[PDB]
Each structure stands twice: as C-alpha cells, then as structure tokens.
Amino acid sequence: TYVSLADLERAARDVLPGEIFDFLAGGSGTEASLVANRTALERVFVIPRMLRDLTDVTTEIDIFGRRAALPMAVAPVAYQRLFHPEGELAVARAARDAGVPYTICTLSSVSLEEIAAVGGRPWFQLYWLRDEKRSLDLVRRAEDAGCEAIVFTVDVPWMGRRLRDMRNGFALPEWVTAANFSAVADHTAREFAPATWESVEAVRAHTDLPVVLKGILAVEDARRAVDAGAGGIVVSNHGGRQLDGAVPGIEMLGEIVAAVSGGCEVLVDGGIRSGGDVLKATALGASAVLVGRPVMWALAAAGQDGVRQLLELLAEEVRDAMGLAGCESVGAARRLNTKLGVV
Amino acid sequence: TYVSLADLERAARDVLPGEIFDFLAGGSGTEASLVANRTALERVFVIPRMLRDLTDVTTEIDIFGRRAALPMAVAPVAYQRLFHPEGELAVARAARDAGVPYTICTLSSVSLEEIAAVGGRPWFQLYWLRDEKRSLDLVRRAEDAGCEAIVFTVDVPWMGRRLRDMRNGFALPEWVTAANFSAVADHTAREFAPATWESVEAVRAHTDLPVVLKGILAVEDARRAVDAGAGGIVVSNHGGRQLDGAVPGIEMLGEIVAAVSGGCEVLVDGGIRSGGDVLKATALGASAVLVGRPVMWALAAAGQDGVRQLLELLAEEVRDAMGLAGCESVGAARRLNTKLGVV
Amino acid sequence: TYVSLADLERAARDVLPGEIFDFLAGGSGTEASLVANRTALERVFVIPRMLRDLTDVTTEIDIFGRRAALPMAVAPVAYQRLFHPEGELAVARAARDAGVPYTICTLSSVSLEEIAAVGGRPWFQLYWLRDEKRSLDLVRRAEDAGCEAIVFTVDVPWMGRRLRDMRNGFALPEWVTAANFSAVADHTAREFAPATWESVEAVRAHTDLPVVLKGILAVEDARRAVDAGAGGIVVSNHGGRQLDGAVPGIEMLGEIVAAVSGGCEVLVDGGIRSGGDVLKATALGASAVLVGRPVMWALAAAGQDGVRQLLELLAEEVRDAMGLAGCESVGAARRLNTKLGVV
Amino acid sequence: TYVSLADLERAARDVLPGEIFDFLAGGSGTEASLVANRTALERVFVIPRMLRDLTDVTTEIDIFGRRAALPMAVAPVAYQRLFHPEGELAVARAARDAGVPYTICTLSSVSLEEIAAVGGRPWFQLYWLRDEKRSLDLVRRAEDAGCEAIVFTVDVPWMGRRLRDMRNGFALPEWVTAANFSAVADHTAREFAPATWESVEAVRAHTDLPVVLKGILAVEDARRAVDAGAGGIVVSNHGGRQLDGAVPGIEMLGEIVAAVSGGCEVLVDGGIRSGGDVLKATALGASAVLVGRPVMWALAAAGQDGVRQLLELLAEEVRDAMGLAGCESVGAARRLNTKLGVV
Ligand SMILES: Cc1cc2nc3c(=O)[nH]c(=O)nc-3n(C[C@H](O)[C@H](O)[C@H](O)COP(=O)(O)O)c2cc1C
Ligand SMILES: Cc1cc2nc3c(=O)[nH]c(=O)nc-3n(C[C@H](O)[C@H](O)[C@H](O)COP(=O)(O)O)c2cc1C
Ligand SMILES: Cc1cc2nc3c(=O)[nH]c(=O)nc-3n(C[C@H](O)[C@H](O)[C@H](O)COP(=O)(O)O)c2cc1C
Ligand SMILES: Cc1cc2nc3c(=O)[nH]c(=O)nc-3n(C[C@H](O)[C@H](O)[C@H](O)COP(=O)(O)O)c2cc1C
C-alpha cells in the first residue's frame, strides 16, 4: 500500500544491493544536474482554475497514432534484470495493462522481440551503433516486432562519468547481458559511435515510424529536430547522468514548446515523481512525460505487481491534480498558467 | 500567557491526539503548497511610513454590511469538536466577543442554527451538495438563521490527497458528526458534487446575501467572479490541502486586486500567523484575511478562553503593526508599499 | 586581541546576564527584520577598482560641520550602564579618542551633560516627550551642552513587541535609570507621544543644529525629510526592534540616495559588522553608517578599552577594504558599483 | 586513483599541518568571496548541443603565442615548498608534461631561473616592488629565462586580512624562503608598493612579452587594460583572499568579454574544480581558466605524480564535458549558451 512514489524508493533501497541502487540513483560528476531536475520542478507552481465542468475528466492522450491512458510513458532504462529477475517483461506487462507506452531499450536484458510480444504497442529506444548498417538493423527489427516509435537517444556520444559506479567498481553481473546483441562506461565508449544529424536522416529514411529525439535541450536543436522530420523530441538532461551542469529539461521546456509551435510532440523527463509533477510539465507545454527511476523502484520492490501499483498511483494522482486544477482534459492542462516561486 | 501564535501551536500539539493534530496541520501530497504559504509571506517586507497622526488608530473595517473589529475573520474549518468538546460554540462565542466574523461550516459538528444563535453576525460556508435543491436548502437555512454572507468554497470538486490522513488511517470518532445533515476523503467524493459557474448563479439567485467565492487563484477567475455578481472572493489554495503545487494566494493577491479594481472584496488566507502578516496582506491589497489553523490551536489548548486570548493577541499585534507602519486605518495600510526580499 | 567584530559578540555573551544579552540582541516579533538586516548585506557584492593611486588613503569625512575619522558614528543605544558600570562615559571616551561621533540618548543612564563633558563633539538622540515644551527642553539642554546634531528618532511612536523581553520578564535593575529625567515597553507607551511632521518642524525651529531623522524607509518620507529642512536621515528599521517585517534600510538606501539627490546626508544602519560592510553601505550611496550592538559587545567585554579596540579594528578594516577596492577617499567609495549575488 | 578534484582536497587535508592547510584554503574576512566563487559557478547551467561531429574533439588552445593542451594554466601560488619539499619544481614538471602553462611566482620558494629550466614555456607573475627599477629587473630576469608572459597581479596593493592566518599566528618555516630575493601580511605591507596604471605602462615598455593583468573585476578596468596594451586579463577576486565582499570573477566575466570584444584574452579564476566548471567558464566567454588550490592539494598529496594525476583527470573531464555538450573545439564551447538556475 504505497501512497506516494517516495514510498517505492524506500522499498527499493531496502532490497537492492548497494551498487545496483547506486547504478540506478546516480548521476554524473557532482550530481548537480540530477539534483537540479528536482529543484527545478519544486520551484514551479500551478495557477489552478475553478468551477469548470468535470463530469468526464479524462487523462488520455493521442500520441504517435495511439491512445495512451495517461500523458506518460515508461522511460528507456537499460538492463532491467539488474532490478528484478523478470526485468523488462514485468515492466512491459504492467505498462500494457495500464495503457501506458513502454520504451524497449537497445541495451535491454531481454530481447526486443520477447518484450514486444507482451503487447501494449511499445516504443523502441535506439543507441547509434558502430555503423549505419547495424543501427538500421535494430530499427528494422523493432519495426518488424510492432514497435510504434523510434526514440533515438541523442545525448550519449559516450556515457557520462558516473562517480558512484567508478567508486563501487560497478560491472554487470554475469547473468545480465545486452540481449539484443565503470565497466558499463568502458563498454559504451568501445561499442557505440557518436550520432549526428546525418544519423537522424539515415533513421528517418529507414522507417515510416515516428522518430523521437531524446536529449534535446537547446532551442535551435528543437527547431532543427522539426526541420529534420522528427515526430517528437524529449527535452531531457538524461536524468543528470550525462553532462554534469546540463540545464534541466523542465527549465527549457516552455521556450522549446514556443519555438516548435506544434511542429512535433514535445515530451520532457527528469525528476517526475507525482501526478502533480505531470501537471506542472503539462502546464509548461509538454505533450507527455517520461518516468524512469520510479518505475525501477517499483520493479525492484515488487516486480510486475509493484509496477502496476505505481502506475495505478500515478494515474490517480494525475486525475486528482487535473480535476483540482479545473482540467477535464490534458489539452486544458496545457493551457494552465504557472508561477515560479522560491523553495 | 501566549505572546505569539506559535505559543498556541506548541500547546495544541501537547494536548491533541497525533492523528487529529495531523488532520489539522497537514496538506495534500508533499505539502509543497502548505510550506509555500509560509515562505511566500516571509519574503514580503513592508515599507513603513513615519510621522503620521496616530491619535485614533482603528483596526476596524466595514465588510458585507457589518463593522468588524479587525480585518480578519475565522476561516471555515470542518468538525471543530475534533479539537475541543465545545467545538464550534466555543469558537463562535469568542469570535462574537472579539467582534470578528465567524464562518459556520457546511460540515460543522454543531448545527448551523445552534452556532448562529450564539450571535455575532456569522457567515456560512457552502459545499455544493448532490443537487441544486439541497444545496440551496442549506443556503436558505443559513439565511433564515441570520448568517450575513455565503462563503461558497470553489476549490473542492473533491477532497485533496491527505497523505498524513491516509497513513494514519484517519476517520472521525463516533462522537463527531456532520450536524447539518482517508475516510473523510471517501465521504466527500460520495456526498458532494463539483461546483461550476452555473452553481454560483443558482446560489446568487437564491439569496440576497453577498456570495463570496473561496479558493480563487487565477486572475480571470477573479474577474469572472465579479462578473458573476460575487460580493467577494478569498484568494486561497485552501491551506495547501487541495492541489499540491497550487500557488499561494499571497503570491496572486496583488495581481488579483488590480484586476478586480474594486469590483468586490478581496480576502486572502493561508499562513497568516501574526498581526504583521495581516499588515503584509493588507499592504498587498487584501480587504481582510481569514485565519484557520491558529484558531483551532487556541480551541484545542484552552477552549473558548484560548480563542479569546488568540484574538486579543492578534488584535494587539495588528494595532502594533499598523501604528509602527504609520497607518491610522486599514485603508492607509492598503496604500503601503512592499518589497520582496530573500530569506 | 580581537580580529573581527564577531570575536566581541562571543566575549559579551560570556559576561552578560542572559536577559541583558537578550535585551541587546533581540528584535520584535519573529525577528524577521533583525535577520534580514544581515541577509541583505550579505547579498551585496562590491565591484572593486584596481591600479588607482593609494599614496594617501583617508577614511575621513566631513559631516554636520565636523571632520570624523571614519564614515561611522556610534548609534543611540539606551541604558548603557546595563552593559558596564561606566556605561555611556566609557563609550563616549573611546569614541572621542577614535575621532568617531557618539550619539547621546534621551534614555541615557548617565546625564547628557556629563557625557557631553567628555568632549568629542557628540550628537543627541531625541525621543518625542509628552509635550512640545519638554521635548524642546531636552533639545535646548543638548545644544547648550555642545551637542552638534539632533538625531530625532521617528520610528518609535511606541516601542515594538520584544518577545525575548516579554518571555524573560525583563525590567531595568534598580541601579540603572533614565538619568536625563516588558517593563521598558510599558514605560515608553506611558511617557512618550508619537512624533509627527509637526514635531519635526517644532524641533527645526527650536535649534540651529542639524536635525537628522532616524528611521526613514519610504522614499517619499526621505524626500519629505529634505523638504522639512532635515540635515540628514538615517535609513533604518531600528535594528529589527520596531516593525517586524520592515524592510532593511540597506535595501532602500540606493533608491533613497537617488531621490534625495544630495539634499541631505543619508546614513544607514542595521547589521554593519565589518569595514567591508561599511564599504558596501558607502558603495550604495551612504554618507556614513551607525553601529549599535557591536559597540555594546565591546563595552560589555572590556569597558572603555574594549570600545577602543573595536574602533581601532573597524578603522583598520575600513582602510583595508577601501584600498583593496581602489578608493583613496570615501567619496571614491561612493562611486563604486555593486552587484547582488546569491548566498 | 582520484576520480574528482575533491578526492585531492581530502588527501591534502590528511597530510598537511593545520596552519598550512589554512594558509592554502583560507580567504580574507568572513570568507564571503571565497564561498561566493563556488556558489556562483554552481548557479550556472550549460545548454548543451547535440548531434555535432565529434570525430576529432580537441581541448587545445593557442594563447600568448603557444599551443596549450587545455584551456587552463596553473595559477600563481606563492611558496610551494610549504606543501611538498620539491615545491615549484614538482608542479612545473607535471605542468610541462601535461602541456599546461605554469605561472612562476615573484614569491616562489625556488628561484625563477631554476623553475624555468624545467622547460614547458612558463609564465611569470609579478608583484610590484619598492621601485620601478627593481620590479623591472624581475621582469627582465623572467624574460631572459624564457618566460612567455608577464602576469602582473593588480589586486594586491597590500595583502588582505587573512583571519585564519592571524588566529593561527602563521609564519613561514625557516626552510621556506622567497628565493627570487599574519607574518606574511606584515612582510608584504613593507616590501611591496601599490601598483598603478603607470606601473603597467612601465612594464609594457620594458618587455615585448604579453602583459596580463590579474585581478580585474570592473568592466571599465577591463576596457582600460585593453587600452593600456595588455595582452590579457584574469577576471578574478584572488580566490577570495583580498577584498572580502568582492564579486566573483565568474559573475563579471560575460559583461567583461562583451566589453573587451576580442581586444585581449580574457581568463577567469576562482573555484574551478572540474572539467565541467571549465566548460562553464568557456561558455561564459573565457579564453582559459587558472586553477590554484587544487594543484596544491595534488602537490601536497603526492608530489609531482599527484599533480600529473590531477592534470590527467582535468584533461579527461574537459574532453568529456566538451563532447557531451557538442563541442569539437574550445571555440565551439565559447558559443554555448548558459542559464542561471537556483541551487
Ligand atoms: C539506470 C538508468 C538507465 C538508463 N538507460 C537509458 C538508456 O539506455 N537510454 C536512454 O535513452 N536513457 C536511459 N536512461 C535515462 C532515462 O530514460 C531518463 O531520461 C532519466 O532516468 C530521467 O528520468 P527520471 O528522473 O524519471 O529517472 C537511464 C536512466 C537510468 C536511471
Ligand atoms: C482542519 C481543516 C479543515 C478545513 N475545512 C474547511 C471547510 O470545510 N471549508 C473550507 O472552505 N475550507 C476549509 N479549510 C480551509 C481553511 O478555511 C483555510 O483556507 C486554510 O486552513 C488556510 O488557512 P490557515 O493557514 O490559516 O489554516 C480547512 C482547513 C483545515 C486546516
Ligand atoms: C539595546 C538597544 C537600544 C537601543 N536604543 C535606541 C534608542 O534609545 N534610540 C534610537 O534611536 N535607537 C535605539 N536603538 C537602535 C540603534 O540605534 C540602531 O538603529 C540599531 O541597533 C541597528 O544597528 P545594529 O545592527 O548595528 O545594532 C537601540 C538598539 C539596541 C540594540
Ligand atoms: C596559498 C595561495 C597563494 C597565492 N599566491 C598568489 C600570488 O603570489 N600571486 C597571485 O597573483 N595570486 C596568488 N594566489 C591567487 C591564485 O592565483 C588564484 O587567483 C586563486 O587561488 C583563485 O583560484 P582557486 O580557487 O583555483 O584557488 C594565491 C592563492 C593561494 C590559495
């Protein structure tokens, strides 16, 4: 019986080995960007509206051609068998049952085809490989398996400096592997090549699926993403795991939404920890959010049923926040105003 | 012998059962809006005037056709028998004796007619019921009993998520009931319907009493309230108990006062804890404030006499603050300027 | 051997009875304005100049017709025998020897004529008495005794609410009296009348000495002071002892200096604790500062010799700060720019 | 195996005598400017760019006619034998091997000619001596020994008030001397004269080497430096060791870069503690940074090899930060935008 997402973090801390909790919790460098993701959300206040018709409040959205139950997807998180033996299958099953898109990772610890077979109209996250030809094979596999969007991660030319992982001497256990094919940082520097705008065009030409660029923070990169034919972007500093000192996505979101001016979907992530945070993101103009660490807390704590409980809690919090703010729909929530405060 | 409102909180904490203290103290979600009500007041500084005539300083105001001794009313707080056996009668008697309006609640634990019989020209707070017909019956009862204003609460389409109450498994004791007719959250979701602008018009047509909309935060909702024929509004986030992340009323007050441009009374609440806080609210343009939790601290600590002592202390602090700031009247206090500082 | 003013506070805390330390240290209400005086100074940063001629750095100023060794006077502090048996005589002797003006108080615990006989061209602080005639007698006594300015305190229509003094049940010991004629708050409410602009004019007509209005915070009150014929003002919230929530003087100083546009001397006080703080005040446009509590710390710690050591330390810190900032004179320091930072 | 610069501070604290750690760590006065150097950097966030070509990322710059491996030089720090017996020779050897300029101090504890003989194309820091003739002798010695720039320190007309050193009664041990010729503060007040713009011109006429003015904070002093023929400036508050309350250099840097408009190199120092901090400085417009205390931490911890490890770590962090931010060159990093956040 969890009444907040924070209840799940406490539960996950109890069960996970310290080094795996640190792999999950940590960020790069001094963790300034990790902390700032939370600080930035905490400074945003919503100006709610009153006395509106709430006889049919709905939290649903249409995105990338599918109805989703909430303005929320499960973020790509590598190697989910680190957290629970059922790994990605547990999370994908719960997401399917909740009507929430699940992002299958390039570095999934269960093969993308197995996770796709769970159903639920999943997305696929791409890391750019050694060459155009192989990268494009994963994309084609994902499309053949029924994935509905390609989430191209664009903020990882290589992995950031994870000092918790370095200090812990973290490496994957023998029983966790990259099923589609700091020791994890060394492996990435060797196996993956930096993506460029040319890589984006190669992907866009290889699939009719919407291509979503994850890790955009500069306004002109958002504009360029639209010009490049992206169907969406995720405004994100990769949970503070990449450039330490990168601005939080939530701080760039409003300016990016204005610049994009409806030319693509604009998602955000980093520190979303409640339905109220989802409302803040929506009020700043997001189409939807991604949620990362909390989904893994729930997986660690109680497997598939833990993820189900998390998604049920988030669904209740989103409905609650929307109605209290006078919003019968997510579109109405996007028209809310906000104020910055001091915390 | 209390010299500050904070002395009363300490006293109430000692006497009340933990779960009832939590029902009183708590807010929704992470309590961000609860804390922000205090932070927001603490950032406001007054620019006092000197060398003005203070030979007849008066703290009185005229509001809703009655002279009040202070620019202050007792906020609606449900179920006052939770805090002291005399409940609403103790508070209403002290308010009457102090010349302060008392707001009788829809969810009062003593009937509205009994509390009105105490005297003191009380107000009545309305929650919108299952249908127009019954809602309007409470309004007519209140008017027949001599209530002088209808304070229509507009920020409770349903009750917020009170995590202290959920964790405590809080429910009303058998000896406390809704005398006019989280377990308290479940009861509200079943018994009350979301109010709309149509509900406001139904009330306005049913009574000649001034209708005051409590829980307005958006500037256009304040304008619309005036257009709808409201006699007042209370700029309020419901003490941080409704939308977690709602802006504090004190942060919207100046902009609302400007937009309303004298078309209705503009009250504020949330975190008023001293006569100096009353002065800040007045300087930002409020007609008057409501005070909630501190009145219940005083009731818990010492019953009717506790509430009397609280109101005497607040009266002294308001007079002190006004005179130190060069204000012989509340109208002069409204013309004070303020500065935001850092705390 | 004290190397900072903070060394003196530690020393005074050791020696003074708790209730007398609290009478000295405390402020009104929640002490928000007391704390804000420090916060406000800490947020100000100086932009120093380099490579200027420092062959004859001088900290002297001319003010109210006298050369002073520093841009600094000892603030009026009532009842100095509370802190040391020699009281005002010890402080006045040290101030004289340092070339710093000393402000003799209406509520001095040694008669104004005795303190004036020490020499050093002192100032006299006036509280407005029961009637024009008696007030004007103190003014005439002060002038006859050789005081060179009248510092009319304008922010005390009555004494603020000193909760430390109330809680301690503070009263003057039998051996400390008002030699020119909370128990101290009760005594003031009875003996003194609120001053007005008419009182200022009565004083201005009664003496050719410069009249300095102490406790101005509003820009139009500063302008009006010039129009009224004041020779100076002290921009001040009375060390956070009067209106709790009054803006710090340091936050109003720049705007007041601009509005006054050389029409009178503009002093500031509240929280000056180093030569660097004096430099900040000067850079914001002050003619000079007053220093209150630290002078009493020094008096408590070591009598006349303690005050001498404090003034020597402040003199060294002022010279140091000025030269490091490229200022050969106080006038050059007034032309420094500042930046607000975060602390 | 250090993974951050903070690992080195912990190591240095363990080994150094307390008073020498304090000589190194401390600042003047209350250490407000020392702390502000860190606060100021922590508030700056970078807006990284994505999807750029990173096939040949280079951290090199050209400055004062030499290629440097990083946009970074070792700051002038007096008396390095305080920290390790090899002192300046250890640091200079490591800097040479890393391709980083080393600044030889006027108050070096090994003679400038010995340190220059190490190689690595060093710079020389000048304090203005008793007269033009002797000052100019050090300059000529430095030039004859192969130093490539003169870093004229302009913020030390005398040494600041180092309260840690005063409290510790710090003095140099007998075995540490000024090899080119608070007890250290007393020695400086006697031996050195305040520099002026005339001193700058005397130096500029005495050498063809670029003259770099270290300790500029005012925009017009930066402009004047260009007009005076300076080849560079270091925007700096001397690590918070000079004027307590001086603005951090990082807070003035952008405005200075705009005013200078390419007329000289603009360096910054104060609190640079990671490659991410170097990126922030570059994004604000710096040509390069200086690093002071961390180099001494490394020297204290492990001598020459410690400094080598520090420089290798900084080089890795700079490359990491640049690439994550989409910058193949330091010039691209200078074109990054930043956002101020709250911490
Ligand atoms: C343990 C972990 C692994 C991750 N792996 C990936 C990945 O393979 N691909 C990717 O695009 N993002 C990855 N992310 C980033 C997340 O998708 C997301 O951007 C980030 O966690 C911020 O959201 P949060 O604060 O909700 O966790 C990972 C995050 C974590 C914590
Ligand atoms: C225990 C409790 C019960 C309340 N019940 C009601 C209510 O029935 N109707 C209403 O409009 N507001 C209600 N309120 C909100 C108050 O009227 C007021 O808006 C809020 O407490 C903020 O003021 P404060 O910080 O002075 O407590 C309640 C508040 C508390 C703490
Ligand atoms: C114990 C005490 C007594 C004071 N008495 C007087 C007074 O009689 N008249 C007056 O104008 N100000 C009085 N002041 C105010 C000071 O003159 C000054 O405005 C204030 O202390 C702020 O300066 P500080 O922070 O340097 O103490 C008093 C202050 C203190 C602490
Ligand atoms: C122990 C110590 C000695 C220093 N000596 C000198 C000096 O002789 N000349 C100079 O221009 N700066 C000197 N500095 C200032 C540094 O060059 C640099 O401006 C400052 O330390 C800020 O950088 P940091 O935060 O990286 O230490 C000294 C700094 C320290 C800590």
Numbering used by the authors:
A (entry chain A), B (entry chain A), C (entry chain A), D (entry chain A): 2 to 182, 196 to 357
Q: Mind quoting what the paper says about this structure?
A:
The redox-active center C4α=N5 of isoalloxazine is surrounded by a constellation of active-site residues [Val78 and Ala79 at the bottom and Tyr(Phe)128 and His252 at the top], where it is accessible only from the upper front side. The reaction center is sealed to form a narrow and low-dielectric milieu suitable for hydride transfer/electron tunneling when a substrate and redox-active center C4α=N5 approach each other. 2 N5 atom of FMNox acts as a nucleophile, but this scenario likewise contradicts the current understanding: FMNox is a strong electrophile that accepts electrons. Nevertheless, an extra chunk of electron density at the top of N5 of FMNox was observed in unbiased difference electron-density maps, and this electron density was denser in the Y128F mutant than in the wild type [Figs. 2(c) and 2(d)]. On the basis of this model, the p-OH group is in a position to protonate C4α-OO−-FMNred to form C4α-OOH-FMNred, thereby neutralizing or facilitating the discharge of H2O2 from C4α-OOH.
p-Hydroxymandelate oxidase (Hmo) is a flavin mononucleotide (FMN)-dependent enzyme that oxidizes mandelate to benzoylformate. Its Y128F single mutant unexpectedly shows a new reactivity and is able to oxidize mandelate to benzoate via benzoylformate, a four-electron oxidation reaction that is typically catalysed by a monooxygenase. In this report, both biochemical and structural measures were exploited in an attempt to address how a single O atom dictates the oxidation level in the reactions catalyzed by wild-type Hmo and its Y128F mutant. The present structural and biochemical elucidation nonetheless strengthens the idea that the FMN cofactor is versatile and cooperates with the active-site residues and substrates in dictating the oxidation cascade.
